[PDB]
Design a protein around this ligand. Structure first.
Ligand code: G2P
Ligand code: G2P
Ligand code: GTP
Ligand code: GTP
Lengths: 427, 426, 426, 427
């Protein structure tokens, strides 16, 4: 069993440098690149007493590759794997795809090809990017379509960072988001999402970080993305494979947009005063304010859910916990899937970073919930797009790249068809 | 003499099968390395019925562990008794089923079934006389339900005269650790009813109910649940492993307990089941444990037997006891519960006894029960199957491996046939 | 008494021949220097059948190592047992064949064959009674196929009454370490079918398949492959080296296994073949190793025997065993596989047994098999030969040494004659 | 077993001084000319505790002989073997052949004759030159024809440096290349080729030498030419003789123009981070950008191939590697040779120069591939020649030497016949 993880854009590599420091600390791998079958799925054996990750950090702008090369994790990462471009994407879906995209994909597509030949147990893929700009929308979408025609059958786990309703960083983000989702709807088997304002809510009420930064945001992202693959790295009472997220969560091949949320999140001084057992974390993960994406699940219905635990978590009590969740009539499951639960247990506990904001805990859970609650988020994203599309705002840049008004309307009606399906399936 | 070839399919099947070889190895007195250190000569007399003689007085088990993932064998091989099994029997694939009946039945199993059928063939030819096959699998998941049911059909055509024992755990609505459990359950029972002559319908929530009420353990893990179901496997195969006053082979149980060919889904049980603190406050005599066997709590299935009627029940006793007390106790249980026993059979209680009880207990008995109450567990799986199938929910993953929706409708018709059959004799 | 003159031609022939003298020297208990240190008296009784008495109780082997390059002898002479061979037998040229059948057969061999024929003549006259010649060569390359086949024809006319044993490894399409292998293979079998009365058709990929599946070694080198093929050479020559209850000379094997003069291309095998960790989990009894011998995995050729039918098979057992178990096991293998044995012969299984097993094993047996499945390996060499010959590819190097294309067409006709002959009796 | 190696021109001797330093370092031979059967094939026994190479560096211009005489390898090389001329060839095929060639060949042809009498195991010849100028075209071609009439039967391994399509050093190079190939087509049994721009590509993407020189280019050439003869110097699991390159690579006596490429090529800091096993080097040697000559093998078909390894390389895994290459339908072999592979193994590992750019590795491979991919290179070389031939450009120098328009047309139609054969054999 093995897997490879690529990173795209500023959002990807800032997760990449932040998550791989956590992976090397779990397996006792020092930052200098050295210290049995637990680290094999992410790290290779480099001859004798040395390892290397199976990853590639690619970005068109060189601002982010040079600091990783001259950072503290210089010897851990391979220097040739750190790919750097020549020209910036400039928050344009077209520019990072066609002009700058076409001249660099030939290096990375052949690189990951030969990087798979030394591998033998490639279960799938998981990518890290953000459709809020150009590199994570244009270059990523070109990568997904050219990988699906080559491999196709293998899974792809998309982890994109979407914008909040009112809070945002860019101003032309819905154009990049609506254009790239036209290609991501059919080529992605599953795609987890994260919001930028909701994650601030996680650290505000619970962790009490009144002045957080993107460094603190990525550390709890590392807990999420490492928990889903914790079953493959270590043994457990009920192990779950990476392909389990395709069968048990995707009821239909185009409805593959689940939410995400994680618990417990607690500070140092609060960790010793709060009791930690499976009950409150099962009550807290379904809490609407503790979600990683701004969607009200009370308005919608859950299609599918999967619970994976870590640490000393016995199976007799967690089955009682979900039984209390089913009889709770606050939330409501859909009639098309009454047995909407997938339980998973792992003995390896959650680790902590030296000097990190998160405290140590004997157990944890990662809740990925499939629901129709993202339909109102997409309609709101499409609603704000119609105001700018009617005035032809920010259109002269994209048509100056080579595109035209055709795919603008194709992305609109395709997003309208996505809304037509989520209202039909929720009946 | 009457060798039984063991087979372990799926994650849960390997776990309960691993506990099965552990608990009987202590009864026969086998070390984890494989050498004999038993105290009695009768332990070695019928050791060949599962094991094979090897060099240095070593005894290897005939356990063929099959699974579509490699990590499951690493946990079993690294166990306490993991070193006794043969390395050649550890045959397995690389890609798991991912909880899909179609993958383990058409694509992942078809490439592996050609390799494992060669392993069971050489083991069956090396024996003196083949009796049957003892399977451990689960209706949940893909490797247990899809591949585990498929190999029985290949063994059915190869050995149509030999019996087929299957200890099959199945899901429940209260304890459900899988989203795609009713599809795997509804498709598996279609294959089990035509091929398997014997099926022990065990439910997980009943094992949780057994450990909670009568045992009252504080922290029951999966290993404690395996100890209950593994003891029932050792109890049914007691008569052909030690002497007894009234021996009953596994085929002898089949003729008594299978009144019709499709009515071979039974409700196993085990007794005595007592806590560590409530042992001194209890007598080990035969009448007190008998009423515990017929109690709804002791049975390892969620169906309350008082909602139906017993077709035919078997009680395989163990230990030195009075035959009159066994013969008089089986009378009064059916006399004062004549409403819960069918009137069109004069005597429904089969019985058997052995002289060598388990280690650590002086007397014991194992309950096997055929009753119309088992249909309650099938219809709740049926309405769960019908609820998800009526809008084609979670079917597109099954169609990728060439599976058609007609087979889902055929399994639904067989599921309707099962619940109507038990309702006929109620 | 019945001396056998050994001969080693080619690089691979010298390697497997070097392992052949190494493995049998341990069976007889010979030091690398040449002195006797065996424990039993029977080891010294039939030591003269390969070796010769010398001063100081030294025993020199009758190994005539021939090769068209000098560096091959330096590796053999500098080996562990390289110092026991006679220096006079090390006769060799300077210019290699360069993987050309024509060079070793017309130019490089013709200048050297006059020197080596004087070496085998004096060795054959010094013996008490010549039995046969044991050759080790390879159909690949030029020195093994060209010169190694040529010396047999000179020995055939000189000793037409004596048998000719040839352990000839041949290429395969999956493992091919030579571009000009089918030309060397197609030309060599034309000479082997008319001269050699015995030929053990060994395939390299099967030895890789044997070491991978049943042995599961981590890093098999060429030396490990030589240990398998060298054991088969020691197994066939066991009856005329130690006492036995049913002796079978190499001529006795020929009369039983060669039903027609051209059908002398067999499929050798050896058993038991077990890993270091799977030895404790296995019994050394006779019925379990017998089914391993008839299995497709144990055979040292890529042809699956289930695609054809056995003409006549021989099993030369070794070690103290029950004759009834050997006589009853040979019956059931042909009874339950009657479709894979010819109906126009009533009994196809030859058998033999010896009292002195190999060192380190209590019981063992060697499989020699004549079957129609061997034609599959010839036609794939034929279509490879026809694919390159139909446009005269890589022929101009052969024509430089005076060779004509008619001989390539004649070898192609003989290759068509071989595959049609085995198809007749299928 | 023995062999002799001559060198011609600036390109030859700059390879000669660069390759012989590597040969003396393998066998523990100090630069002062002194320190059993391993060094016998290249170096002789000079009485007692002293050796000398079996080579001759000949060049018409004296610029290159005097620096080797006064360099650092003064005592290693014989002073009489270092032959020097009197007048420069001046990038003229005619001048280095007839005017200046005829007065110096009588010294060197008789010298190598008596130099073979002390030898006894002369397997063949291998020469080093370049048809991009005059000395490596005129004087070399006169040497090949006068050696083939004397010996003939012995093999000759030509290692010429051909120009790139657009990058070049001279300006009248196709006249020298097309004229000398008329004689080299029939007298050469085999001829490996190297390009000047492709080898820069080897050190750019892999070794990351942004400012290389011809010193660095010749060190990896020394690894190539020493690997092909590594089987003769040291024992191996499957030894291959020098004559194996004639039978297993030449399907027809006039089609004897194979390509060349080598792997692994990796820097110092990248050697410790990259894993080194037989899989990726077998995947990398067939890579089109890692070739030593600018030809696209995807357009053509392979006629014959031979793989020779070094170091600890077991035979069971390399047979699996080529099996993965055959089923890979990216490349395609010709139907006239399905078994187009020749495997070779050697236990002696690849050595490194003290202070050299190449890093140490436990194993390596040298891939010489025969294919029809050079046909488009010859047609491009002939295409650029037709533009200059039509205007009679640079013709007054050659006719001033003694030649005329006859052999210009004979070289043209002979090169046209070479193109006619490569298109016929590729059907
Ligand atoms: N009484 C026990 N029940 C178990 C145990 N392990 C799992 N299970 C139960 O059986 C259910 C499904 O059985 P499995 O774990 O074997 C799923 P399977 O291995 O067959 O498919 P894949 O793992 O997807 O390849 C599972 O959801 C549990 O409710 C166990 O150790 N003991
Ligand atoms: N089982 C083994 N096979 C070997 C061994 N050595 C080589 N071979 C195989 O036999 C094939 C050809 O046999 P040889 O190596 O003897 C070639 P030969 O010496 O006869 O001709 P030249 O070396 O060209 O003079 C060769 O391609 C290998 O597939 C070995 O040691 N063991
Ligand atoms: N949660 C989170 N989001 C991030 C982080 N880093 C970047 N982002 C998001 O990434 C978005 C911008 O996307 P990109 O396409 O990567 O922007 P870029 O790489 O600078 O591209 P150019 O402006 O064209 O150079 C912002 O809106 C952020 O919300 C991070 O560390 N954590
Ligand atoms: N790869 C490589 N090529 C070289 C090297 N040295 C010279 N060359 C090539 O040699 C070519 C010139 O060939 P020559 O005939 O030897 O030139 P010359 O010896 O100076 O001859 P004259 O100019 O007449 O004196 C150039 O185009 C170079 O590409 C070297 O060290 N490495």
């Amino acid at each position: 069993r093995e897997c490879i993880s690529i990173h795209v854009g500023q959002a990807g590599v800032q997760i990449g440098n932040a998550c791989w420091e956590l992976y090397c600390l779990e397996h006792g791998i020092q930052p200098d690149g050295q210290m049995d079958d637990s680290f094999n799925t992410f790290f290779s054996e480099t001859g004798a007493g040395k390892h290397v990750p199976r990853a590639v950090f690619v970005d068109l702008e060189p601002t982010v590759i040079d600091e990783v090369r001259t950072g503290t994790y210089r010897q851990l990462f391979h220097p040739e794997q750190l790919i750097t471009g020549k020209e910036d994407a400039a928050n344009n879906y077209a520019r990072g795809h066609y002009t700058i995209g076409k001249e660099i994909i030939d290096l990375v597509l052949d690189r990951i090809r030969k990087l798979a030949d030394q591998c033998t147990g490639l279960q799938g893929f998981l990518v890290f990017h953000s459709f809020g700009g150009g590199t994570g929308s244009g270059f990523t979408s070109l990568l997904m379509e050219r990988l699906s025609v080559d491999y196709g059958k293998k899974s792809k786990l998309e982890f994109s960072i979407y914008p909040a309703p009112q809070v945002s960083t860019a101003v032309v983000e819905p154009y990049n988001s609506i254009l790239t989702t036209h290609t991501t709807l059919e080529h992605s088997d599953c795609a987890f999402m994260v919001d930028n304002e909701a994650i601030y809510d996680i650290c505000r009420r619970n962790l009490d970080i009144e002045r957080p930064t993107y460094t603190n945001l990525n550390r709890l992202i590392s807990q999420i993305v490492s928990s889903i693959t914790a079953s493959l790295r270590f043994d457990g009472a009920l192990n779950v494979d990476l392909t389990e997220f395709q069968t048990n969560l995707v009821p239909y091949p185009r409805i593959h947009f689940p939410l995400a949320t994680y618990a417990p999140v607690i500070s140092a001084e609060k960790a010793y005063h709060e009791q930690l057992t499976v009950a409150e974390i099962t009550n807290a993960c379904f809490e609407p304010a503790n979600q990683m994406v701004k969607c009200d699940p009370r308005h919608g219905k859950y299609m599918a859910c999967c619970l994976l635990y870590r640490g000393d978590v016995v199976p007799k009590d967690v089955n009682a916990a979900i039984a209390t969740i089913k009889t709770k009539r606050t939330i409501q499951f859909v009639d098309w899937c009454p047995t909407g639960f997938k339980v998973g247990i792992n003995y390896q506990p959650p680790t902590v970073v030296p000097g990190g904001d998160l405290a140590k805990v004997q157990r944890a859970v990662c809740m990925l919930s499939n629901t129709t609650a993202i339909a109102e988020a997409w309609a709101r994203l499409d609603h704000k797009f119609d105001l700018m599309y009617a005035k032809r705002a920010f259109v002269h840049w994209y048509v100056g790249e080579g595109m035209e008004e055709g795919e603008f309307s194709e992305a609109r009606e395709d997003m309208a068809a996505l809304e037509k399906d989520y209202e039909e399936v929720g009946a | 003499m009457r060798e039984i070839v063991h087979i372990q399919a799926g994650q849960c099947g390997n776990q309960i099968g691993a506990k099965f070889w552990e608990v009987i190895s202590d009864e026969h007195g086998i070390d984890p390395t494989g050498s004999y250190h038993g105290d009695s000569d009768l332990q070695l007399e019928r050791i060949n019925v599962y094991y094979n003689e090897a060099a240095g007085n070593k005894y290897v088990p005939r356990a063929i562990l099959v699974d579509l993932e490699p990590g499951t064998m690493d946990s079993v091989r690294s166990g306490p008794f993991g070193q006794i099994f043969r390395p050649d029997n550890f045959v397995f694939g690389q890609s798991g089923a991912g909880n899909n009946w179609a993958k383990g039945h058409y694509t992942e199993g078809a490439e592996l079934v050609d390799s494992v059928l060669d392993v069971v063939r050489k083991e069956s030819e090396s024996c003196d006389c083949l009796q049957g096959f003892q399977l451990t699998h689960s209706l949940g998941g893909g490797t247990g339900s899809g591949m585990g049911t498929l190999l029985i059909s290949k063994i059915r055509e190869e050995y149509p005269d030999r019996i087929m024992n299957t200890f099959s755990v199945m899901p429940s609505p209260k304890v459900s650790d899988t989203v795609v459990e009713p599809y795997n359950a509804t498709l598996s029972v279609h294959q089990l009813v035509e091929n398997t002559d014997e099926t022990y319908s065990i439910d997980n929530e009943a094992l949780y109910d057994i450990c909670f009420r009568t045992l009252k353990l504080t922290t029951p893990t999966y290993g404690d649940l395996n100890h209950l179901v593994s003891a029932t496997m050792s109890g049914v195969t007691t008569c052909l492993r030690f002497p007894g006053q009234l021996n009953a082979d596994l085929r002898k149980l089949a003729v008594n307990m299978v009144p019709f060919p499709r009515l071979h889904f039974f409700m196993p049980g085990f007794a005595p089941l007592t806590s560590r603190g409530s042992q001194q406050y209890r007598a080990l005599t035969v009448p007190e444990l008998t009423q515990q066997m017929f109690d709804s709590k002791n049975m390892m299935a969620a169906c309350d037997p008082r909602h139906g009627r017993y077709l035919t029940v078997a009680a395989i006793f163990r230990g030195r006891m009075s035959m009159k007390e066994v013969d008089e106790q089986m009378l009064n249980v059916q006399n004062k519960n004549s409403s819960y026993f069918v009137e069109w059979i004069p005597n429904n209680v089969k019985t058997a006894v052995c002289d060598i009880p388990p280690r650590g207990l002086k007397m014991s008995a194992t309950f096997i029960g055929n009753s119309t109450a088992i249909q309650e567990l099938f219809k709740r799986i049926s309405e769960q199957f019908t609820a998800m199938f009526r809008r084609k929910a979670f079917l597109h993953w099954y169609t990728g491996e060439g599976m058609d929706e007609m087979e889902f409708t055929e399994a639904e018709s067989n599921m309707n046939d099962l619940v109507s059959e038990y309702q006929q004799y109620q």
